[PDB]
Short mmCIF file of C-alpha atoms in Angstrom, two decimals:
data_model
loop_
_atom_site.label_atom_id
_atom_site.label_comp_id
_atom_site.label_asym_id
_atom_site.label_seq_id
_atom_site.Cartn_x
_atom_site.Cartn_y
_atom_site.Cartn_z
CA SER A 66 12.99 2.96 18.29
CA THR A 67 10.37 0.65 17.54
CA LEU A 68 7.16 2.68 17.01
CA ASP A 69 5.19 2.03 20.27
CA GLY A 70 1.48 1.02 19.77
CA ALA A 71 0.08 4.55 19.69
CA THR A 72 2.63 5.82 17.18
CA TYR A 73 2.27 2.73 14.99
CA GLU A 74 -1.48 3.28 14.82
CA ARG A 75 -0.99 6.90 13.73
CA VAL A 76 1.68 6.14 11.12
CA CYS A 77 -0.17 3.07 9.82
CA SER A 78 -3.43 5.02 9.56
CA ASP A 79 -1.76 7.87 7.66
CA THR A 80 -0.01 5.41 5.34
CA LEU A 81 -3.06 3.31 4.51
CA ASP A 82 -5.59 6.16 4.41
CA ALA A 83 -3.48 7.92 1.78
CA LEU A 84 -2.97 4.72 -0.23
CA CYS A 85 -6.74 4.21 -0.26
CA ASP A 86 -7.30 7.78 -1.46
CA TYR A 87 -4.68 7.40 -4.19
CA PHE A 88 -5.99 4.03 -5.41
CA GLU A 89 -9.45 5.58 -5.59
CA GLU A 90 -7.94 8.50 -7.50
CA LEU A 91 -6.29 6.15 -9.99
CA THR A 92 -9.24 3.79 -10.51
CA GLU A 93 -12.00 6.48 -10.65
CA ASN A 94 -9.91 8.22 -13.44
CA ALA A 95 -9.52 4.80 -15.27
CA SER A 96 -13.31 4.80 -16.17
CA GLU A 97 -12.55 2.48 -19.19
CA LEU A 98 -11.33 -0.37 -16.83
CA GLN A 99 -14.45 -2.32 -15.71
CA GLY A 100 -14.68 -4.69 -12.73
CA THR A 101 -12.39 -2.47 -10.63
CA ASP A 102 -13.27 -1.46 -7.10
CA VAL A 103 -11.57 -0.15 -3.97
CA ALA A 104 -12.83 -1.12 -0.52
CA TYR A 105 -11.41 -0.02 2.83
CA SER A 106 -12.49 -0.92 6.34
CA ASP A 107 -11.14 -2.50 9.52
CA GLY A 108 -7.62 -1.58 8.45
CA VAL A 109 -7.87 -3.65 5.25
CA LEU A 110 -7.48 -1.96 1.87
CA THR A 111 -8.76 -4.02 -1.08
CA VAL A 112 -7.94 -3.06 -4.66
CA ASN A 113 -9.77 -5.37 -7.05
CA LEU A 114 -8.38 -4.73 -10.54
CA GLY A 115 -10.61 -7.22 -12.36
CA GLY A 116 -10.57 -10.87 -13.32
CA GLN A 117 -7.37 -10.68 -15.35
CA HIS A 118 -5.20 -8.58 -13.04
CA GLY A 119 -6.38 -9.87 -9.67
CA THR A 120 -6.81 -8.27 -6.28
CA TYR A 121 -4.33 -6.55 -3.98
CA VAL A 122 -4.83 -6.63 -0.22
CA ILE A 123 -2.91 -4.23 2.03
CA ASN A 124 -3.74 -4.38 5.72
CA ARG A 125 -2.80 -3.27 9.19
CA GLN A 126 -1.72 -6.21 11.37
CA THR A 127 -1.73 -4.64 14.82
CA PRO A 128 -0.24 -7.44 16.99
CA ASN A 129 2.87 -7.43 14.77
CA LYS A 130 2.96 -3.64 14.28
CA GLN A 131 3.27 -4.29 10.55
CA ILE A 132 1.54 -3.63 7.24
CA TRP A 133 0.90 -6.83 5.30
CA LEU A 134 0.63 -6.96 1.51
CA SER A 135 -0.65 -9.61 -0.88
CA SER A 136 -0.02 -8.93 -4.59
CA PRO A 137 -1.59 -11.05 -7.36
CA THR A 138 1.82 -11.27 -9.08
CA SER A 139 4.48 -11.08 -6.34
CA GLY A 140 2.68 -12.73 -3.43
CA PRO A 141 2.76 -11.93 0.28
CA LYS A 142 5.03 -9.60 2.26
CA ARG A 143 5.17 -8.22 5.80
CA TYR A 144 6.48 -4.66 6.21
CA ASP A 145 8.06 -3.00 9.26
CA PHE A 146 8.31 0.76 9.71
CA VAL A 147 11.68 2.52 9.89
CA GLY A 148 11.90 6.19 10.77
CA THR A 149 9.91 8.59 12.92
CA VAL A 150 6.49 10.21 12.90
CA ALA A 151 8.19 12.99 10.93
CA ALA A 152 9.32 10.68 8.10
CA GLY A 153 9.92 7.02 7.34
CA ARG A 154 9.13 4.07 5.12
CA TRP A 155 7.83 0.50 5.23
CA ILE A 156 10.43 -2.20 4.52
CA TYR A 157 10.29 -5.97 3.95
CA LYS A 158 13.06 -8.23 5.19
CA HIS A 159 13.66 -9.97 1.83
CA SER A 160 13.49 -6.99 -0.53
CA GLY A 161 15.29 -3.69 -0.95
CA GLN A 162 12.17 -1.91 -2.15
CA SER A 163 9.69 -0.12 0.08
CA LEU A 164 5.98 -0.91 -0.03
CA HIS A 165 5.40 2.12 -2.24
CA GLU A 166 8.26 1.24 -4.59
CA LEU A 167 6.73 -2.21 -5.11
CA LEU A 168 3.39 -0.65 -6.01
CA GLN A 169 5.18 1.82 -8.29
CA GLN A 170 6.74 -1.15 -10.07
CA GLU A 171 3.60 -3.25 -10.45
CA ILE A 172 0.71 -0.80 -10.88
CA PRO A 173 1.73 1.40 -13.87
CA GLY A 174 1.64 -1.55 -16.28
CA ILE A 175 -1.92 -2.32 -15.23
CA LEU A 176 -3.29 1.24 -15.21
CA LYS A 177 -1.74 2.23 -18.53
CA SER A 178 -4.28 5.09 -18.69
CA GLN A 179 -2.77 6.95 -15.73
CA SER A 180 0.37 8.80 -14.71
CA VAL A 181 1.26 6.85 -11.56
CA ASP A 182 3.52 8.06 -8.73
CA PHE A 183 3.15 6.30 -5.38
CA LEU A 184 6.30 8.04 -4.10
CA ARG A 185 4.43 11.30 -3.45
CA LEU A 186 2.40 9.70 -0.63
CA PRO A 187 3.09 9.78 3.12
CA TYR A 188 5.64 7.46 4.74
CA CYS A 189 7.84 6.30 1.87
CA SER A 190 10.78 8.61 2.66
#
């Protein structure tokens, strides 16, 4: 393939909607961590983890049929989808790790209060 426009929109929506839900799950449980907030609109997911840890941005970029990521520690990446509507993952041309594996690497050390597993979410097969 590539995912055509309609399929990309469905897969991207499912991927990002679930990530938003999970980041809300993690940050609403971490009640002791102040200055955190999750915002989500227009295909842009914002995870502000405070003044020390910075802000993640994960967003749909429709013209490119990609998901873009900016991490306060590892910087920017553009992800393409590989797979089908049934199962797939988001991959970046200069890393072996999927989007969700990157978050699994970087987030647990920040949210030490939580048991973190991004690999249970849709579209990281």
